Amino acid sequence: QAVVVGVMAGEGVQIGVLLDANAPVSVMTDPLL
Amino acid sequence: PQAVVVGVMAGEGVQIGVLLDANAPVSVMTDPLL
């Protein structure tokens, strides 16, 4: 299971990323950054 | 300077305070705001 979302970044630049469905945000916010 | 706080008016009269992204274009925010 997974999900894809539009992550907004610097000056509002739109970026697309794929994230796990069940893992908590705390374990993914580091590699995502 | 990355964000600004504003009060948004919604249906029939409820006012809600929100902190918006100061540089993304408004059209990108209207959907999640609703």
From Swiss-Prot, chain B:
Classification lineage: Bacteria, Bacillati, Actinomycetota, Actinomycetes, Mycobacteriales
Annotated protein name in UniProt: ESX-5 secretion system protein EccD5
Location in or out of the cell: Cell inner membrane
Function in brief: Part of the ESX-5 specialized secretion system, which is responsible for the secretion of EsxN and a number of PE_PGRS and PPE proteins, including PPE41.
Disulfide cross-links: none
Residues included from the entire protein: 18 to 51 of 503
Oligomeric and partner information: Part of the ESX-5 / type VII secretion system (T7SS), which is composed of cytosolic and membrane components. The ESX-5 membrane complex is composed of EccB5, EccC5, EccD5 and EccE5.
Additional observations: Was identified as a high-confidence drug target.
UniProt family annotation: Belongs to the EccD/Snm4 family.
Effect of loss of the gene: Mutants are defective in the secretion of EsxN, PPE41 and PE_PGRS proteins. Mutant is highly sensitive to detergents and hydrophilic antibiotics such as ampicillin, vancomycin and bacitracin. Virulence is attenuated both in macrophages and in the severe combined immune-deficient mouse infection model.
